């Protein structure tokens, strides 16, 4: 079910966040949901991390030039190739964790690309995208995609 | 779940220095990059990852066909290091994307340098 999947997306995102460190940790983690999505309704209700920090989420436009300073995390929906390039031009050089809802465009762009709809959520990770992100991501995060 | 919060200072091998970059028109690695790759390879195996996809890239200088081949040779050079690090040969997929998917601006020397790369992808 879509609700069931949305909650699973919320949990895997919280899981991934726990393996990430920002060079300047905010009081409130800012998440922007960008582009059409199926599984973000849970995210958008807001979350709390196990370290006590609130995650504030809202939808922002694909063509907002300040995405890189308006969030710590971007959850990227189904956007075409022009839009996708636009988004990552905006993010370049900002310390932003990027996660895409679908798992097919992970050659460039997002650090993590989810696969939702199987018995369990998995993801691909692009280490080059991670290296360029400006945030620290511990390799043991990769265990979340397995088992 | 959220056990990453227990992590301290060890093993953070995916930082800025972990990019796998190549010199202009080069498809071979030098000691700085091969050392970098072995550390990445060891980090992955340490967290029970035994399967990767390697995607090679070029900047946009020259014709498309030449760059397609160059990108494949780059991915092959990285695969060799993964094999020698202990990753099973059959678990390493190699792909060349040529000049088609730049991560940086080809209009600058610095940007072209960033584009000459192999991206290590850890599949689901």
Residue numbers in the entry:
A (entry chain A): 40 to 186
B (entry chain B): 44 to 167
Please give the exact wording used by the authors of the publication that reports this structure.
The YfiBNR system contains three protein members and modulates intracellular c-di-GMP levels in response to signals received in the periplasm.
As expected, both mutants form a stable complex with YfiR. Finally, we crystalized YfiR in complex with the YfiBL43P mutant and solved the structure at 1.78 Å resolution by molecular replacement using YfiR and YfiB as models. The YfiB-YfiR complex is a 2:2 heterotetramer in which the YfiR dimer is clamped by two separated YfiBL43P molecules with a total buried surface area of 3161.2 Å2. The majority of the α1 helix (residues 34–43) is invisible on the electron density map, and the α2 helix and β1 and β2 strands are rearranged to form a long loop containing two short α-helix turns, thus embracing the YfiR dimer. The YfiB-YfiR interface can be divided into two regions. In region II, the side chains of R96, E98 and E157 from YfiB interact with the side chains of E163, S146 and R171 from YfiR, respectively. In the YfiB-YfiR complex, one sulfate ion is found at the bottom of each YfiBL43P molecule and forms a strong hydrogen bond with D102 of YfiBL43P. Similarly, in the YfiR-bound YfiBL43P structure, the sulfate ion interacts with the side-chain atoms of D102 (corresponding to D71 in Pal) and R117 (corresponding to R86 in Pal) and the main-chain amide of N68 (corresponding to D37 in Pal).
